[PDB]
A paper describes a structure:
Family D replicative DNA polymerases (PolD), found exclusively in Archaea, contain an unusual RNA polymerase-like catalytic core, and a unique Mre11-like proofreading active site. Most Archaea, including the emerging Asgard superphylum, encode an unusual heterodimeric D-family DNA polymerase (PolD), composed of two subunits: DP1, the small subunit, contains a Mre11-like PDE fold and carries the exonuclease activity, and DP2, the large subunit, contains a double-Ψ-β-barrel fold and carries the polymerase activity. A catalytically inactive exonuclease variant of P. abyssi PolD was chosen (H451ADP1) to prevent active digestion of DNA substrates (hereafter named PolDexo-). Proliferating Cell Nuclear Antigen (PCNA, the DNA sliding Clamp) was added to stabilize the PolD/DNA complex.
Two primer/template (P/T) DNA duplexes containing mismatches were designed to trap the polymerase in the proofreading mode. The first P/T construct contained three consecutive thymine mismatches at the 3′-end of the primer, while the second substrate contained a single G:A mismatch at the −2 position of the primer. For each substrate, cryo-EM structures of the complete PolD holoenzyme (DP1:DP2) along with PCNA were determined in the act of DNA proofreading with resolutions varying from 2.9 to 3 Å. While the template strand points toward the polymerase active site, the four terminal nucleotides of the melted primer are shuttled toward the DP1 nuclease active site, located 45 Å away from the pol site. As expected, but now structurally observed, the active site of DP1 contains two metal ions coordinated by four histidine residues (H362DP1, H497DP1, H560DP1, and H562DP1), two aspartate residues (D360DP1 and D404DP1), and one asparagine residue (N450DP1). Two Mg2+ ions were modeled in the exonuclease site of PolD-Exo, as the cryo-EM structure was determined in the presence of MgCl2. The terminal nucleotide of the ssDNA substrate, which is located within the exonuclease active site, is present as a pre-catalytic complex, with the scissile bond positioned between the two Mg2+ ions. The ribose moiety of the nucleotide to be cleaved is stabilized through a hydrogen bond between the 3′OH group of the sugar and the carbonyl of the main chain of residue H560DP1.
Residue numbers in the entry:
A (entry chain B): 885 to 994
B (entry chain B): 333 to 442
C (entry chain B): 1051 to 1215
D (entry chain B): 664 to 829
E (entry chain A): 173 to 619
F (entry chain C), G (entry chain E): 2 to 247
H (entry chain B): 112 to 277
Amino acid sequence: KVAKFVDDLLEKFYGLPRFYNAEKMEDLIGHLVIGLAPHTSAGIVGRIIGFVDALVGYAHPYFHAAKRRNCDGDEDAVMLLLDALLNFSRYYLPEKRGGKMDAPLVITTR
Amino acid sequence: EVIGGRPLFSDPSKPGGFRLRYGRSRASGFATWGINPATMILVDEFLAIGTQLKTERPGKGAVVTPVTTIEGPIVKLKDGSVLRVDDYNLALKVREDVEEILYLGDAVIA
Amino acid sequence: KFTHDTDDIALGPKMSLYKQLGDMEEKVRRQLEVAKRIRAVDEHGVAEKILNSHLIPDLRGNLRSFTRQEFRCVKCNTKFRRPPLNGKCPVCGGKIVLTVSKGAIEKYLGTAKMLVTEYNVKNYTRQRICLTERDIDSLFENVFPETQLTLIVNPNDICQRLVMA
Amino acid sequence: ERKMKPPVQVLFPIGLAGGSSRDIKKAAEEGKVAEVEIAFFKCPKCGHVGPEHLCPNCGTRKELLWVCPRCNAEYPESQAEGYNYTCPKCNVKLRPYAKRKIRPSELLNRAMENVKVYGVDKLKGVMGMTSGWKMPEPLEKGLLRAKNDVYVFKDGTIRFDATDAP
Amino acid sequence: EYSKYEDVVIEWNPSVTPVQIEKNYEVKFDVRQVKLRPPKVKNGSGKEGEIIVEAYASLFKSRLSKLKRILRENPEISNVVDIGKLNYVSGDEEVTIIGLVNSKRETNRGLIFEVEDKTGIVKVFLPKDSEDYREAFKVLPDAVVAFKGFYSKKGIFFANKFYLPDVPLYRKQKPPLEEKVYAILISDIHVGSREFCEKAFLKFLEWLNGHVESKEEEEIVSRVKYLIIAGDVVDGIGIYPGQYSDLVIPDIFDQYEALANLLANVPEHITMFIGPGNADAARPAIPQPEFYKEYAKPIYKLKNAIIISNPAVIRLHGRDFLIAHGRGIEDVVSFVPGLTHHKPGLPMVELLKMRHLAPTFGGKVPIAPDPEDLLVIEEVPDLVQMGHVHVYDAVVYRGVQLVNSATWQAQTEFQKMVNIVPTPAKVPVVDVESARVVKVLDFSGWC
Amino acid sequence: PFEIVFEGAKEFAQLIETASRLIDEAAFKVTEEGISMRAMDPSRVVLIDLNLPASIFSKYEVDGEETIGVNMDHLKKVLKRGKAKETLILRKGEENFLEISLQGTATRTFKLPLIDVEEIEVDLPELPFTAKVVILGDVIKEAVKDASLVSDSMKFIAKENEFTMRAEGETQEVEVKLTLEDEGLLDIEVQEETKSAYGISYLSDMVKGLGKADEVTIKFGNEMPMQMEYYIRDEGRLIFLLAPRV
Amino acid sequence: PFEIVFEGAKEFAQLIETASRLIDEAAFKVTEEGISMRAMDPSRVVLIDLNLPASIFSKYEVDGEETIGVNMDHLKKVLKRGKAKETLILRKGEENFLEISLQGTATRTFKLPLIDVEEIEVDLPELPFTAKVVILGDVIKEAVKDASLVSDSMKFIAKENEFTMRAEGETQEVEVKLTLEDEGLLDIEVQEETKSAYGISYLSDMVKGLGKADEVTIKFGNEMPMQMEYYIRDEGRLIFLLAPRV
Amino acid sequence: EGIVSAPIEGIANVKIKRNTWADNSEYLALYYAGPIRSSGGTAQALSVLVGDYVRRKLGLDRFKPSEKHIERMVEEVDLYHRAVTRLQYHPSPEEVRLAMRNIPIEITGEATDDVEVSHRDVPGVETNQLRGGAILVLAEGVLQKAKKLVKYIDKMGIEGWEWLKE
DNA sequence: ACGGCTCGGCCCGGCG
DNA sequence: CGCCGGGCCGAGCCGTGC
Ligand SMILES: [Mg+2]
Ligand SMILES: [Mg+2]
Ligand SMILES: [Mg+2]
Ligand SMILES: [Zn+2]
Ligand SMILES: [Zn+2]
Ligand SMILES: [Zn+2]
């Protein structure tokens, strides 16, 4: 659904060619995401290669360590890279202390 | 403390609880345990892939992951027979006749 | 590298049973059968006493907060530290509702009484539960008097049995 | 998936016109007028005013309006830059927002005509914005989110939460 | 270790002969004596959520009406006008308003109030240069006060005088008594606790039986007739988390049995009046009609024990005694600055001046949803007794004594944590005729 | 392996619903003569029993006696799917399932599981009733509906040739008075003046679902429970026992 | 001490319910010629006058003029219990209680407490109304129900032998045109073209529950309050005065 | 490593204060906001260490609290556990006194809880309510993570922290 | 320790 | 044509000694 929304946004709002062109979840393989922890301000880029029938997020221990997570009950968020690139803005962040937590202010590429 | 609805699987360092095995599976090692799916099935499916549990010896908290090479529970049936359920389909077939869980199974800790 | 191997990475139950139980009584009962099945748990009193320190805090905390609570208008969200003398919102025609209802106090009393009667706990917890029920009954003496009789008495309750002993 | 405490599909303030659920479409269809604090942008050429980044008449990027708190003089961004974001006639720092009245009917009709999305039943917004800028979001994005059944977060992203395993 | 004072027997000394005196006494107020008619729903299909609100509103209405009737006694207050019909008055007239204090704040000019009554709310300002500013500063909300001043059509009621229900300055002395009679006050025994000072209590019980050194104390003992206990006679069950390790007797039945066995040793010529407290098996919120009978039966069965309520008023030889536990002192201590638990006699005077025993709603005291307020001091007493503080004090304010009997429980972990120094084993001795404290016994040597 | 055929499934659905209005679980005792039911609501305030002999059943065939337990919610939900003219059929094979079938313009069979419920014998012995009255369903129904307007309780007063039922509120009052010369009452037999009071909720729950052309008999005494009866198809009988107030 | 007997309690219930949709508390005056009524909407935008002369009532007797003050909600709840063929009796005695008795198959009596309410007597004489028209209830009912969809404000236009109702919105629009040849338009009398607008909510309240075969008189002027009146039983009548919006 | 937002949002402000009651010297105070409450034990202790190093490198003196400051801190630590959260750690009062006496900077902050204190109008402290950010730093920072802190001190060539080593 | 538990209001379908 | 009743939605709240 997120990819369909992104394609509709690209075709109807900006007038640009569609990007994902996916009809099933197996068509998202090879596309990039961003992983962010609920207490940090930097994200990391990951790639999709497969799916499982469980309710967990499998990844390398380096991937979970790079988000300062311990992997003993923690939970993190994932978002498509292009959706975040188009949609994120620093003018929607709350003004009180704590509005910059959970924000991709910078992303690591390696 | 025990919250209503959240079971307690073993008493501190009590024989018959979780058997300690030293090792690391394909999908475990950071802070997670390795558990046979048979002992997930035979505890009324209160344990699922990714369910957290508060541990005693190594740390405080872990996530369970299926390992099919370690041993499973030993159960006592309603007619008096004693069986070793190291398989998943066998547990599914036998679940309804279980009178007492003699042994709980193994846990692989890194 | 790795030490142990597994046939499948997503083999086994996929959803916890805790998410498929609605009532608190059903949750407690299922958890207690689970604890009874396992040989190395010793539910019979241990799980009750440890579990009773999750319902007793709720009961006593709700009972305490009932007598010092703030009221609010349904139409607005303005809160009043003291009930209005007119019974209605001064800046509305809307009616005043409580923030701690009477049914939010005694929602776990049935399960607590079941846990007390079906298992052997220390006399301290049993007396605490009996006194909690007595206090709940006594706080609402002049507001909700007992005006309805019943056909049969003695529903196998434990408080009167302890008192008569 | 992740949703706010009241679910939100567009970061647009509605106040009380939308009801308990902050439904923008219901307020638009009932002809209600709402007063909220937002940022208004002004077209340098023709002088359009409203909470839009692009002028519908000519398609030329507008500029943010700065307003005095006590005094009520509006200064565009280019002029407010010279004034150091302080009112000349007063001695109080300027602000990019003020309490203003909006009519959801015209805005929603323009958005629907813009993205060609008409059959949407609900469109939830916020009671008020939390930033210091109070810059709103385009309503076309909210319509496309409502059409595809996806939600939004505090920074304008769609997120999915899951337990992590190695 | 489960001894419950089963074999604690003290016999009267056959050396001191008590003087024959006719016990003239009668209970003047009891909570389980006013018949509170429960409320009727506005229609035939009501629910629980509305009756409670209506009962609370009725309670506050009754409080306001009773305190207004008390206020309209002094000749100085006159020309009362309703708050609702205040816009229909001139700007050059002397008017008064009586209502409940919603909230108060402080500014450079003075104090701003939100006095409210049955017919709407109004804002009242009092200048800092007023003569009653000091008195009105240390007032806590939900009390009933009277104001005097000029009402402005702008929206502020400017005032120049402050009033409280107070106590009359002049009173008529009572006729003298024929023979002298004495009374003893006790509170906060806390039977069943590890910190309960049992040896001092036993020594005091022997003192009541004639084991006395000085001749004047012999005469006082021979003249003792009445004894009053102001609650907290047992340590309770489940008062706070972690109490199980603090209890020698972890059984409420056994606690009351031990207390009855202790109190059975009083002489047969003394009448005991016992009231409940915040640790006993009784109603969670004040007023408490009595103990739970099925738990306090061993103390109900005593030959000369009389069970009273909280609060209750007793009339011994024409002298009125107002007996309460004293949970309302905490509100005065925590509001007014400069007041501590080490000197509880001043918050007692504050409560007496405001003529209510627990005004603040939503603080440190629980208030029951009764349709009638029984915590208003309707009549002026001769003596006032309180406990719950574990510190002794005694002052006199305009002819009424304000005692605070000490505890019988040594300092425990909590009072050590929060810096309170108890004074256990102190017992006031009062004179019935004078209605004043004439001596203080101190049995703290053993405890 | 017993076959049951019932004409007018709507009536059966209505009686099942009026039995379900108070209790949630019950067990049916069916013998060669007929089928019977009896249980009590968890508040221990009301008692309902029901009998259905072989005469009213158009086709009866049963071997021995069997105790069956059915979820009353699912039972009434299935029964509500019938029509006014279809014939209701109840069958049970060797499996522990109840086969509920309806035969109108088409035949539909519902499979519904059997449940086990503990059966407790609870019979209150016949008590000395000082008054009896026979009235129509319509009059008592409207009287209950009016009494629910002012108060949550309704008061009965019995006297020779005078049967009055009232309810007082805080300010308002409603009184229903009628005699032998009126229409709603058929006959009245009292031995002494009688007075009682009963909750509005229970009375409204029990009288709801009665036909206008029906005869209901009320037996009650002084500060003692009340019994309400009404014949079903001239052969059955319904017993309601309600505790009084005060 | 007056005794008033009325037939067809349903009609009285409808009349009171129509009178109860704008006001909650008001006073009733009773006099030899009949019963009057004049209440005021709390919003001070719609005026209601109701007059019930004595001839309509079957047995109407009273001496002098008295005032009666009753809350409308309780009264509407009491009268809503009446059926199509129940006799409605209004009786008052020395005691300050209003007795409403419903005579039928069972004599059920209600008692209501009178409440003191202030009376503001403002008699409005004939105003210069540019247009006076008479239409059936169904036509105006359907017109209002159609106009409720598009917007919340309804426009009236009266021209020479023409009656047009219109409502406008952001994008939608509905119009209704009435001519003499139409059955709904009985007659029309206008001196010059007039136009004004009103609110749908108040209009819906005044026209809802209007009989199909009723001739309704409409009088209004340029940006002036509208006068609506329809006769009941050919003897009593109700007058509505709705102030225009903007 | 520049990942978690402790530097960005944990540290509300930095100010230079004067030790008027004792010697009128110059010291440094760190204001801790709400978000520092969820940064982990290691981030807070390193923040205190960095504050100490910067105050020593800027030629500033050390904090010299009065007794009232100590009593206020002990009652705040006692109160927050009783009324807000379990603290995940319970320092003894003597440990609190030792830490307050031997820390060269003032660990303070704004008010985050709607609870009033007993020791009021303490000089230098501008609030009479619980300061959750600072007390959590003290409890779960230099105290709970003392071993890692002393290891960092040894690796870092920092003196003046012998009391923590003892 | 915080998602789970009570209330109240507001439309939307049947249903008679 | 007018109710009865469900099913959503949104508010609030969760041990404690003087
Ligand atoms: Mg972790
Ligand atoms: Mg006490
Ligand atoms: Mg005490
Ligand atoms: Zn309101
Ligand atoms: Zn432009
Ligand atoms: Zn300006």
